[PDB]
């Protein structure tokens, strides 16, 4: 058809123009400019606390906003709240579905979000007059496994599922106020901006997309990976982010430049990255692999500076405190470790 | 502890009580059998569940002779299988259902590829997975009565051009069973259980119970070191 041919040629011309515009703004590289700075020495971290009590593989965790409490989820059917300072358990929530794959902590400390592989996102209220934790709202409407959920405030939450669609919900009512579509493969992870105005998502089609909470449509798309994307995280500044994939390669993308800056990979690593996180100052990039240990990279020189060995199975979750005092890693051996 | 105040020892006692409750609840979840269910969609898994009946994940819990079975059906998911299959690594057994009347039938989307070839490819993919290298597979063959009714009107040579036999019920059943069992590549770590479905629930329940008991006793003998 003439219309189909003209649409295809218009799309090809637009893609070529976008590629040419991206190439035009490429004058130098991050490594060459940064090479003049003094590299940081070897980083030594030792475990302090060991959190035990789970009886199955741990799939998600999230640090509290006070840098003292955390929450962990595992397939045994329990959601456990840990006090890191004294290694005490505050609450243990029995789940209706044991196939949990994500969890999230409210920024105010009153609610906890749970979900995964059940098309239902549950909200649990911690501050109750009756003295027990009870579910307050069940959100439904997805047609695929739930992969990630993040709080915005006490009445807003953003979720991503396996149906190639992200949703912004309203807890009080229970209806999707905004839907984001455009991904081909399944959506695996999302990251919220510090100002809670934009967020980014990574999909199984080796792509990442920058969305808009207030507007509701995609803004920019980033490519470069050769396999599935499993993790994503914003820079502390908020003008760049990092992606981890299954081809033993991490990448750093810039929102303002809309291009690639640095690539972190080694010839001795052939496994897949499972978690990606940053530091308080944005200098250390922590990557949790499935080779039973985590790695620490220099975000400005792409040189490895430490390995956090100590886990006997896959490392699936990793988190860094708001004040940057410690880092918590979880694994499939039902053990959590705190490093500093 | 001596440094702990009066408001810190009560927290320790509460944590110990939580630990005791978790330990008590964890020993009851290991006394139940977990069975994954797979198939070809319309291969007849629904009627198999119906014979032994008491969105993405369907759970069926039922007891028989003081033994509890929990069965996970994942038919209504429609997602990427490789991104969540490792969640079912610790299942006791995987049930795979095959219809005997699909050899003449073809796929609705395309008539080039038979339903039998698709079922065989699915069985080969599931059996040789890296996560299920030591998990038992129970193969059910259903819709045998209609297959027997229609066997005379169409030779099996349409589905298998290289077949040369008496074109009777026993020979065709043995040939199909052998072709399904020949797809195994380990032959030392896992075995395939084959049964022909009947109209009586008791036979199917007894076969499932015997299979799971044999799997459990073999596994525990292997862990004991004698086997």
């Amino acid at each position, epitope marked *: 058809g003439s219309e189909l041919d003209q649409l295809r040629q218009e799309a090809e011309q637009l893609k070529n123009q976008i590629r040419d515009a991206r190439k035009a703004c490429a004058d130098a590289t991050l490594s060459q400019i940064t090479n003049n700075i003094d590299p940081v020495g070897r980083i030594q971290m030792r475990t302090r606390r060991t959190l035990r009590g789970h009886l199955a593989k741990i799939y998600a965790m999230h640090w509290g906003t006070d840098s003292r409490l955390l929450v962990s989820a595992s397939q045994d059917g329990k959601l456990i709240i840990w006090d890191s300072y004294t290694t005490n358990k505050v609450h243990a929530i029995p789940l209706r579905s044991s196939w949990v794959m994500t969890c999230a902590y409210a920024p105010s400390g009153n609610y906890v979000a749970c979900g995964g592989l059940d098309n239902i996102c549950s909200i649990y209220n911690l501050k109750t007059r009756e003295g027990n934790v009870r579910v307050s709202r069940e959100l439904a409407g997805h047609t695929g496994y739930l992969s990630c959920c993040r709080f915005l405030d006490d009445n807003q939450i953003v979720t991503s599922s396996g149906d190639t669609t992200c949703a912004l919900w309203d807890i009080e009512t229970g209806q999707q106020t905004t839907t984001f579509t455009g991904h081909t493969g399944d959506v695996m992870s999302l990251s919220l901006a510090p100002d809670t105005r934009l967020f980014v998502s990574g999909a199984c089609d080796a792509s990442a997309k920058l969305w808009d909470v207030r507007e509701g449509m995609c803004r920019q798309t980033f490519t470069g990976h050769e396999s599935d994307i499993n993790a994503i995280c914003f820079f502390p500044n908020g003008n760049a982010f990092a992606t981890g994939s299954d081809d033993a390669t991490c990448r750093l993308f810039d929102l303002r430049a809309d291009q690639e800056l640095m690539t972190y990979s080694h010839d001795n690593i052939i496994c897949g990255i499972t978690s990606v996180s940053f530091s308080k100052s944005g200098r250390l990039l922590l990557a949790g692999y499935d080779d039973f240990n985590c790695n620490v990279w220099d975000a400005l020189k792409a040189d490895r500076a430490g390995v956090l060995a100590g886990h006997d199975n896959r490392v699936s979750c990793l988190g860094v405190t708001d004040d940057g005092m410690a880092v918590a890693t979880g694994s499939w051996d039902s053990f959590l470790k705190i490093w500093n | 502890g001596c440094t702990l*105040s*009066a408001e810190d020892k009560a927290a320790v006692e509460r944590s110990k009580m939580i630990d005791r409750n978790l330990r008590e609840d964890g020993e009851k979840a290991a006394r139940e059998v977990k069975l994954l269910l797979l198939g070809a969609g319309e291969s007849g898994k629904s009627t198999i569940v119906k014979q032994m009946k008491i969105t993405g994940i369907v759970e069926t819990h039922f007891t028989f002779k003081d033994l509890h079975f929990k069965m996970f059906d994942v038919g209504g998911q429609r997602s990427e299988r490789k991104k969540w299959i490792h969640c079912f690594e610790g299942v006791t057994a995987i049930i795979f259902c095959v219809a005997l009347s699909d050899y003449d039938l073809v796929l609705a989307e395309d008539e080039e590829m038979n339903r039998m070839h698709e079922s065989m490819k699915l069985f080969d993919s599931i059996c040789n997975n890296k996560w299920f290298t030591d998990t038992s597979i129970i193969l059910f063959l259903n819709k045998k009565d209609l297959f027997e009714e229609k066997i005379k009107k169409s030779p099996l040579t349409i589905c298998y051009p290289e077949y040369a036999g008496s074109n009777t019920y026993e020979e065709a059943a043995a040939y199909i069973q052998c072709q399904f069992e020949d797809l195994n590549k380990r032959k030392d770590t896992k075995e395939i259980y084959t049964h022909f479905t009947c109209a009586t629930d008791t036979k199917n329940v007894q076969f499932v119970f015997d299979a799971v008991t044999d799997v459990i006793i073999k596994n525990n003998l292997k862990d004991c070191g004698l086997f």
Partner: single-chain antibody
Framework: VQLVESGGGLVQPGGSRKLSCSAS????????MHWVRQAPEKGLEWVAY????????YYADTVKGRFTISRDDPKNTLFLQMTSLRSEDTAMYYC??????????????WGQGTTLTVSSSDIVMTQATSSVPVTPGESVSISCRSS???????????LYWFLQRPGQSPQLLIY???NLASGVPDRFSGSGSGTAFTLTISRLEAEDVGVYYC?????????FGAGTKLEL
């Protein structure tokens, strides 16, 4: 949520009695229980404490070896058995719930109270004043002092402020000397350091008339302060 206690009445000096209270509206099996005594025209007095699961039981030196405390979670009931009753056991008895974990606020609900009449080291906590006549529209400051420092190595300061309206059960106002309770106006404030503590109230109305008590929870036994009265 409500606690209802009973078992009162007048008895001869030689006799044994049982006080029974029932809880309804919350998980009775997750809250530790305290018994509090109040002599007529006097202040409060701690009696006994039982933990969740009957793990730790604490008694008062005055009634040690003479009072028994029992808990029934099947029936959601608390029992207090008294064997020998002297002439100083005539008072009002309350039942208090308290849950201990990181960020919790003990001493939430104080029950209703029952009357018991009979015919015929520790930390000293002191109240500065005893009666301050005031008028609505002005701030009121109340001072409390402790013999020993209530500050711990972790930084906590176990101080609790209470208020008993005329004919009403006491209620919690401030816990740990800095944290405001739930359901009270933001006007009430508390502060202090070391052995000195201050409670300030602003924009008083006619309904804020009662007695304020300062209590320490650093170590057992729990000692209540004196009583400061306010007038309209």
């Amino acid at each position: 949520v409500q606690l209802v206690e009973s078992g009162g009445g007048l008895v001869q000096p030689g006799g044994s009695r049982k006080l029974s209270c029932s809880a309804s509206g919350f998980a009775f099996s997750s809250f530790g229980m305290h018994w509090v005594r109040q002599a007529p025209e006097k202040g409060l007095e701690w009696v006994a404490y039982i933990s969740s699961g009957s793990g730790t039981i604490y008694y008062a030196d005055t009634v040690k070896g003479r009072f028994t405390i029992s808990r029934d979670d099947p029936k959601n009931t608390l029992f207090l058995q008294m064997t020998s009753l002297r002439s100083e056991d005539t008072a009002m008895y309350y039942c208090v719930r308290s849950i201990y974990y990181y960020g919790s606020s003990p001493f939430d609900f104080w029950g209703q109270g029952t009357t018991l009449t009979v015919s015929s080291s520790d930390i000293v906590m002191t109240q500065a004043t005893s009666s301050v006549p005031v008028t609505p529209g002005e701030s009121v400051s109340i001072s409390c002092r402790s013999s020993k420092s209530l500050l711990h190595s972790n930084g906590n300061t176990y101080l609790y402020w209470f208020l008993q309206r005329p004919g009403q059960s006491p209620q919690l106002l401030i816990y740990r000397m800095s944290n405001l309770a739930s359901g009270v106006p933001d006007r009430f404030s508390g502060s202090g350091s070391g052995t000195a503590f201050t409670l300030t109230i602003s924009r008083l109305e006619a309904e804020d008339v009662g007695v304020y008590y300062c209590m320490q929870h650093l170590e057992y036994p729990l000692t209540f302060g004196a009583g400061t009265k306010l007038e309209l």
